[PDB]
Design a protein around this ligand. Structure first.
Ligand SMILES: O=C(O)/C=C/C(=O)O
Ligand SMILES: [Mn+2]
Ligand SMILES: [Zn+2]
Length: 351
């Protein structure tokens, strides 16, 4: 029944009305009832009337405490990206460096050309990325799709234990420039994410369907055996870049989508994604959950080589939402198998 929706696992775009846009969890459940999740990634175009902030003009003085210079090494569609932390700077300082002749977007016709330029000049003239900046750009009273307070069951983490994980159950702001990249990865604890592009040049995305996620990992282990030996989940280090031609070459299914200013992207549990920014822009993101996520949460393979890594206790979710399995899970005998095609149960309203 669910195998039949989005059998192509292609990235879908949605244009909700304002009435549909009002309830977050409901619409996430709806797009899953339409098979959106099978692609790993979905675009949601918000109603034109809607706006998160009146104007983006206060922000030139906002501080980026940890700007990152992205150095990329590799060839033949395989790269490892290293981070060099630059001293703090203001948004206005960032934009100046961004729109600079040295770091600005090259000229091009079709998108396919900018894409080609990105994968050709990736390792040259390393850009700076205003990444992982704590904060929101939402006006306090916006009650629709507010990244600051989406009210999903991921809230059970803070509610239960007081714990906040920056960027995961709190918002992050990403100021980008041309040729800034995010490497291949799934979310922490294989959660969902939401990404809103407040302004600027586009953000382009690649995605691999959760049902083919394992194939991508097998490829990644083969191309990076040393890293594979040292960490059970080295892609979570977010340092690994792999070109679409390489994916194509090894028969990994994937899709592309370009995110425009004022557009939302949703990534789904175990959806591998990666991409780059076109020029100076600004993005906001956080993770969130549905009931479907819980099993992914239980089974996520986590980075084994850094103390710093995010690890959410699943205990509370299993007790509240899978009580009949708790004792079994705690005894390590819960062998539930995940079906990536099934939508979250809350969509029983629609399917
Ligand atoms: O904004 C980025 O660079 C990445 C975003 C994401 O992975 O959602
Ligand atoms: Mn992500
Ligand atoms: Zn690791």
């Amino acid at each position: 029944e669910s195998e039949t929706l989005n059998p192509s696992a292609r990235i879908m775009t949605f244009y909700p009305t304002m009435e549909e846009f009002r309830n977050f969890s409901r619409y996430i459940a709806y797009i899953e009832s339409q098979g959106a999740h099978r692609a790993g990634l979905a675009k949601v175009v918000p109603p034109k009337e809607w706006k998160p902030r009146a104007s983006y003009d206060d922000i030139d003085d906002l501080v980026i405490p940890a700007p990152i210079q992205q150095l990329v090494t590799g060839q033949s569609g395989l790269f490892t990206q290293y981070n060099i932390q630059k001293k703090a700077m203001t948004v206005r300082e960032f934009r100046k460096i961004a729109n600079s002749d040295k770091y600005c977007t090259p000229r091009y016709s079709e998108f396919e050309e900018l894409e080609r330029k990105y994968w050709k000049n990736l390792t040259f003239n390393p850009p700076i990325y205003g990444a992982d900046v704590n904060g929101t750009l939402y006006e306090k009273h916006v009650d629709e799709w507010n990244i600051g307070r989406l009210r999903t069951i991921l809230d059970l983490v803070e509610k239960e234990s007081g714990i906040t994980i920056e960027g995961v159950n709190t918002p992050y702001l990403y100021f980008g420039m041309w040729k800034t990249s995010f490497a291949w990865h799934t979310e922490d604890m294989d959660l969902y994410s939401i990404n809103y592009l407040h302004f600027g040049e586009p953000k382009s995305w690649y995605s691999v369907p959760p049902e083919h996620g394992k194939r991508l990992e097998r490829l990644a282990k083969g191309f990076f055996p040393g890293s594979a030996q040292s960490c059970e989940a080295f892609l979570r280090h977010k340092m690994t870049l792999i070109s679409p031609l390489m994916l194509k070459k090894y028969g990994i299914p994937f899709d592309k989508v370009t995110q425009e200013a004022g557009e939302f992207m949703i990534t789904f549990p175990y959806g591998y994604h990666a991409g780059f920014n076109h020029g100076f822009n600004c993005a906001e993101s956080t993770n969130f959950a549905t009931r479907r996520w819980i099993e992914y949460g239980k089974q996520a393979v986590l980075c084994s080589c850094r103390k710093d890594m995010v690890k959410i206790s699943m205990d509370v979710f299993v007790r509240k939402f899978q009580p009949e399995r708790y004792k079994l899970w705690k005894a390590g005998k819960d062998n539930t198998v995940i079906d990536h095609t099934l939508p979250t149960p809350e969509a029983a309203e629609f399917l």
